[PDB]
Design an enzyme around this catalytic site. Structure first.
Site, PDB file in Angstrom:
ATOM      1  N   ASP B   9       0.838  -1.195   0.000  1.00 19.71           N
ATOM      2  CA  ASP B   9       0.000   0.000   0.000  1.00 19.71           C
ATOM      3  C   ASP B   9       0.874   1.245   0.000  1.00 19.71           C
ATOM      4  OD1 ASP B   9      -1.996   1.903   0.212  1.00 19.71           O
ATOM      5  OD2 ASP B   9      -3.112   0.817   1.751  1.00 19.71           O
ATOM      6  N   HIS B 554     -24.805  -0.836 -15.590  1.00 23.05           N
ATOM      7  CA  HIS B 554     -23.750  -0.482 -16.529  1.00 23.05           C
ATOM      8  C   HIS B 554     -24.129  -0.985 -17.913  1.00 23.05           C
ATOM      9  CE1 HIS B 554     -22.280  -1.850 -12.548  1.00 23.05           C
ATOM     10  NE2 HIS B 554     -21.694  -0.666 -12.516  1.00 23.05           N
TER      11      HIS B 554
END
EC number: 3.1.-.-
Lengths: 130, 1033
Positions: B9, B554
């Site tokens: 990260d 979508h």
RNA sequence: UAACUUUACGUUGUAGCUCCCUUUCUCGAAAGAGAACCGUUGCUACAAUAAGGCCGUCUGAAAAGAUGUGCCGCAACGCUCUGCCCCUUAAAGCGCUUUAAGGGGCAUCGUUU
């Protein structure tokens, strides 16, 4: 109600200012640092930052570009005093527990020592509160 | 000896990691470790400048002062040896004794007078010290002042610049030298040389000795000798090197070849975007518009559209616009070509019609000559001896080029002919990040810390089978870019709040809190002009809120396209167009044969005001499904590409052997975070880094497939089914291991020991015995230690220290900052009482505003005040307990930072000795502890009776077991006047202390003050004991 | 980008002149001056401009002197070198010390320079 919170900004243990809210207290630390930086080799670089953007004067520039990185050694110890002039709580610790925390002894240890230590803070901040 | 996958990260100031054990088919089965590694940002804490640039500026200032001092010292040596300067008239320092402090008047009157050798040396040393400015924003202003004084002496009646200087600056004001930012006083070095030679002439005319010696030369030797400037070697060393011939330096964009190359690359990366169709430029179009940068000046996108033949609605891709695409941008220009053309126009060589006769190679040579040298003299002298001189002064009058490119000259000069037509060893541990490839301080620091984490992981457990790095959207951006991002996030928050207000106003009957789905529904319906985008009907606004009537879908199927965008969603009703499936709006609307339904569908998605990007993505139906999916799944930033190549090349990965480094995208990580049940809290803690690192380490290709097949099952009806989780109770296990508290309940006490964390895991996850393994340890955020012993020695303000017997540190405060609080601490406050009430009136008149009250000049007044003198700055006493002696013990400063804080026993009391950077430079180790109230002179004295325990640095882990409670974290700072340490909690938890820190720790009477040591993985917590006091030097 | 050439500003010190203005003493005399001393406004100079540490370098018996387009010093990164802390293994002894090996971590060590 009577308990009023103050802010004693001090650098290297030397008391410098005294405010009413933390916002100006932290802003004041930046202004002191910036004006100090502008006294030498960093003044040349700091002049554009006050000029290339419409943030003239250090105080105004800090007012919008405020950062929590206000340099170290700046101490913003937060005490609160009622209208009677007697200190009640420091930071998040009561005056009875403050001396137990920052001075390291409870009330049951030595009461008359507080008149030499707890009362010592009162006159210490009596001179500070000007 | 265990198969596992490592995630990361990487951020600007934190690299949270995690390793996830996987089975033979790379399906995550367990979680075996994780953690967070926090570090300071590799940037200036204020304004986010470059630390190396600031240090270089300081070094250059030191160098300038050293050179000026050396030059004046050589001048004094010359004056001592050239004839005489009354030999042995110097002090012990070698300076000048009784030097006449009127050197401007000396330069004025030296034209007709026989100067005394003392006055002659005064004027001469004045000339060398203030030796003007040479050609070699803020600079332009200084040149304006130089030019103004230059013109005054040329057309005036004054010979020497100093003569006019005093004779007119004394009429204008009281000063002759420059002040603050008044460049009306600056001079020029050529005029100073003329003044010097005429001064020598005059001192010879009036029979003054000490003029005709070797001085007259040596004076110019000191005056005009100058350190030269850079060459091409600096460009080679400090920038990249060509693979074909590293020996070759880097070209400049101010050359014809570089401009042609960048124009051709821009053409190669430009397409035509109309009606959801992306088509590259045809050869005829490319030839048609290639003449444009030379036929005209600038290439605006609208201009490019006008020149060529295409539809009006056809926009251009690659133009990374945040919003407001209505305004057209500019493509690129021939900077060098147009600059040369306009210079020739202005210098009687071009009329904007005649072709540029100079060859492209000649233009390249001119650009290289102008860019390699930073001064006019070297350019004119060398020019590689190429071109005629008339155009040389023509260009040098206005033209100035300074830039560079990424490729070597030859390399470009050989690629262009072929392009105009249209065309180490792997080891166990990761090597250091190459500073050349990553020329960014913040990213380099982040990658170095990530490499430290990877090396620690490899050492403890072994080679990772795969790497799943993904960095925040802030890494790889300038500080101004990051500030713009956070600002836009702030107004995007305001806008969300206003949208929620709009939704509540429109539907007060709606209960609960407006989530993202319904607010998006309402905003998009407002943007959709009140019509569904499948059948083109008018839909019920009242029924919009309820479920079933409408649902976000979508248009591009998720399983095959893998798109999750902010506005790539179509507000379809449902139960009326449930036959779309995974077919994309090309065969459901039957766009194969341009059926009518397709026609009005396109019309309603283009005529109605929708975002252009949405209009384009909805209407592609002509893409590469796998390529587009991988474009919306991975990330291809410079930093992620570099990480992929570097980690793949330079370390072992026991994976499948094809691609063992997987750089992910932020949107997909956020989506999978949402699916797997993130909830809880974030951004108030430093363990969400490890949370996202665990999430990305479970985003294996098998999992994108399990997601793909589940979404494919969900697209058509095919009929609480949990979304694909890496394992049962994934959210519970991950949030117990990361935070230590169950999901949704951030009020429980953290289980911060192995025993209680294991018990909590066993009691809450009894159905999954794999949550408790030998590697189950509580997360402890690791802060990068900073044991360096260097830094600013003392603040940059030098304060007078004559009255240091008291605490006062008298200093001159400019009137534009004199507050009411600075009037009480003023020196001549009782000495000059009238001026105290004179200045206090101005404070009260403008309401305590020195900037406005003292904008007009303030003045002193006589007993019968008659405008005697002017106050600009006044002395201000300030209390000064301790400070650093600076300027050869002429002024005092303030301590900068504590580089170390030792501790001392003898009385069960830990006495703290602050060590500052200025003390380390001098080799002085303090022998005085800290006691409250009393100053340093009264501080406790350290001797052999005080036991030495350890030494504290900032961000160095410590544990004070006071009687009331135990406190653990990283030492931050100390109150010098109070002697209490500041402890930062490891995770900087915002519910503990003041924004995560424990200020005012009582160490003098603590039961046990000791410091520990933490591994780079945040493990192996154990105390560290010093044996003897470490020397400062 | 790189590094660059800079003069220039500023802070503090010293000295010159100059503003107000202390006690002070001298002159008269009650506030105005003459010498001081101490503060201090403005201006012109020189010095320093991190704290500190090195060379080069000609003399030379060197306290030191003669010299120079002089070098380093607020950062990142690293582990070839020394040191700190830290485990790991072995050897002995007396957990503790010593010796030896290995792996790190971090700088006062090293490179960029």
């Amino acid at each position: 109600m009577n308990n009023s919170i103050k802010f004693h900004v001090s650098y290297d243990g030397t008391a410098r200012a005294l405010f009413n809210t933390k916002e100006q207290a932290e802003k004041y630390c930046l202004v002191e640092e910036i004006n100090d930086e502008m006294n030498g080799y960093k003044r040349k670089s700091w002049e554009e930052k006050l000029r290339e953007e419409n943030c003239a004067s250090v105080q105004d520039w800090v007012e919008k570009n405020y950062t929590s990185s206000y340099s170290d050694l700046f101490n913003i110890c937060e005490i609160e005093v009622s209208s009677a002039g007697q200190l009640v709580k420091i930071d998040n610790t009561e005056v009875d527990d403050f001396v137990e925390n920052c001075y390291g002894f409870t009330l049951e240890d030595d009461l008359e020592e507080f008149n030499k230590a707890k009362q010592y803070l009162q006159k210490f901040y009596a001179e500070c509160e000007n | 000896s265990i198969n596992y996958i490592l995630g990361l990260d990487i951020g600007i100031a934190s690299v949270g990691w995690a390793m996830v054990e996987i089975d033979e088919e790379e399906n995550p089965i367990r979680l075996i470790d994780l953690g967070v590694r926090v570090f300071e940002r590799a940037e200036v804490p204020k304004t986010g400048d470059s630390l190396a640039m600031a240090r270089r500026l300081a070094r250059s200032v030191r160098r300038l002062t050293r050179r000026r001092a050396h030059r004046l010292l050589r001048t004094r040596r010359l004056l001592k040896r050239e004839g005489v300067l009354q030999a042995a008239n110097f002090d012990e320092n070698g300076l000048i004794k009784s030097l006449p402090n009127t050197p401007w008047q000396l330069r004025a009157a030296a034209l007709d007078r026989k100067l005394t050798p003392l006055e002659w040396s005064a004027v001469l040393l004045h000339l060398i010290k203030h030796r003007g400015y040479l050609s070699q924003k803020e600079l332009g202003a200084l040149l304006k002042g130089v030019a103004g004084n230059a013109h005054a002496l040329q057309t005036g009646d004054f010979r020497t610049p100093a003569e006019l200087a005093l004779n007119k600056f004394e009429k204008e004001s009281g000063h002759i030298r420059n002040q603050r930012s008044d460049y009306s006083h600056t001079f020029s070095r050529k005029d100073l040389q003329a003044e010097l030679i005429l001064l020598f002439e005059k001192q010879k005319e009036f029979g003054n000795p000490h003029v005709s010696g070797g001085l007259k030369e040596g004076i110019e030797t000191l005056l005009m000798t100058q350190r030269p400037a850079l060459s091409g070697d600096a460009v080679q060393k400090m920038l990249g090197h060509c693979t074909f011939e590293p020996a070759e330096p880097k070209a400049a964009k101010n050359t014809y070849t570089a401009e042609r190359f960048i124009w051709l690359t821009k053409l190669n990366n430009l397409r035509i975007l109309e009606q959801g169709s992306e088509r590259p430029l045809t050869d005829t179009e490319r030839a048609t518009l290639m003449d444009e940068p030379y036929r005209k000046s600038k290439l605006t996108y609208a201009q490019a559209r006008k020149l060529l033949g295409l539809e009006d609605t056809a926009f251009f891709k690659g133009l990374r616009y945040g919003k407001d695409n209505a305004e057209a941008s500019t493509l690129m220009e021939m900077k060098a070509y147009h600059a040369i053309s306009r210079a020739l126009e202005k210098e009687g060589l071009k009329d904007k019609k005649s072709p540029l006769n100079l060859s492209p190679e000649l233009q390249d040579e001119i650009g290289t000559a102008f860019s390699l040298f930073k001064t006019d003299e070297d350019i004119t002298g060398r020019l590689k001896d190429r071109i005629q001189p008339e155009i040389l002064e023509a260009l040098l009058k206005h033209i100035s080029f300074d830039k560079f490119v990424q490729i070597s000259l030859k390399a470009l000069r050989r690629i262009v002919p072929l392009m105009e037509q249209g065309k180490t060893e792997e080891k166990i541990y990761l090597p250091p990040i190459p500073a050349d490839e990553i020329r960014n301080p913040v990213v380099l620091r982040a990658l170095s810390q990530a490499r430290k984490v990877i090396n620690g992981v490899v050492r403890r457990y072994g080679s990772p089978a795969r790497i799943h790095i993904e960095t925040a959207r802030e890494v790889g951006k300038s500080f101004k870019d990051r500030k713009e991002i956070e600002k836009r996030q702030e107004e995007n928050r305001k806008d969300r709040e206003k949208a929620a207000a709009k939704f509540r106003e429109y539907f007060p009957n709606f209960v609960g809190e407006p989530k993202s789905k319904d607010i998006l529904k309402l905003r998009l319906y407002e943007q959709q002009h009140g019509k569904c985008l499948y059948s083109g009907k008018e839909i019920n606004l009242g029924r919009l809120n309820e479920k079933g009537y409408v649902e976000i879908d979508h248009a591009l199927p998720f399983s095959r396209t893998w798109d999750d965008s902010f506005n790539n969603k179509v507000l379809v009703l449902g139960s009326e167009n449930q036959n779309k499936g995974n077919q994309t709006p090309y065969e459901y609307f039957n766009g194969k044969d341009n059926s009518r339904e397709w026609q009005e569908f396109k019309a309603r998605v283009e005529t109605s005001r929708f975002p252009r990007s949405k209009k384009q993505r909805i209407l592609l139906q002509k893409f590469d499904e796998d390529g587009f999916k991988e474009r919306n799944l991975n990330d291809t930033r410079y930093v992620n590409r570099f990480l992929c190549q570097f980690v793949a090349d330079r370390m072992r990965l026991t994976g499948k052997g094809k691609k063992r480094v997987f750089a992910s995208n932020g949107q997909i990580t956020n989506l999978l975070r949402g699916f797997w049940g993130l909830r809880k809290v974030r951004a108030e803690n430093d363990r969400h880094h490890a949370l996202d690192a665990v999430v990305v380490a479970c985003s294996t290709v098998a999992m994108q497939q399990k997601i793909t097949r589940f979404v494919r099952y969900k697209e058509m009806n095919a009929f609480k089914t949990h979304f694909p989780q890496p394992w049962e109770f994934f959210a519970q296990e991950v949030m117990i291991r990361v935070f230590g508290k169950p999901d949704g309940k951030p009020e429980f006490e953290e289980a911060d020991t192995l025993e209680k964390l294991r018990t909590l895991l066993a009691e809450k996850l009894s159905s999954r015995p794999e949550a408790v393994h030998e590697y189950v340890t509580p997360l402890f955020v690791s802060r990068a230690p900073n044991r360096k012993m260097s830094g600013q020695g003392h603040m940059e303000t030098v304060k007078s220290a004559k009255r240091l017997d008291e605490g006062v540190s008298v200093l001159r405060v400019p009137l534009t900052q004199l507050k009411l609080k600075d009037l009480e601490k003023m020196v001549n406050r009782e000495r000059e009482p009238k001026l105290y009430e004179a200045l206090k009136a101005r404070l009260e008149a403008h309401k305590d505003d020195p900037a406005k009250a003292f904008a007009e000049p303030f003045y002193k007044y006589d007993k019968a005040g008659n405008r005697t003198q002017q106050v600009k700055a006044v002395r201000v006493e300030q209390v000064q307990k301790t400070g650093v002696w600076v300027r050869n013990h002429n002024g005092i400063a303030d301590n900068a930072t504590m580089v170390r804080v030792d501790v001392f026993e003898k009385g069960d009391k830990y006495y703290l000795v602050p060590i500052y950077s200025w003390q380390v430079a001098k080799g002085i180790l303090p022998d005085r502890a800290v006691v409250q109230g009393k100053d340093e002179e009264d501080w406790q004295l350290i001797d052999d009776s005080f036991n030495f325990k350890f030494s504290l640095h900032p961000n160095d882990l410590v544990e004070v077991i006071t009687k009331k409670a135990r406190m653990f974290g990283y030492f931050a700072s100390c109150h010098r006047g109070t002697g209490n340490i500041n402890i930062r909690i490891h995770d900087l938890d915002h519910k503990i202390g003041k924004n995560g820190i424990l200020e005012g720790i009582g160490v003098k009477t603590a039961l046990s003050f000791q410091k520990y040591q933490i591994d780079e993985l945040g493990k192996e917590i154990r105390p560290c004991r010093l044996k003897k006091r470490p020397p400062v030097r």
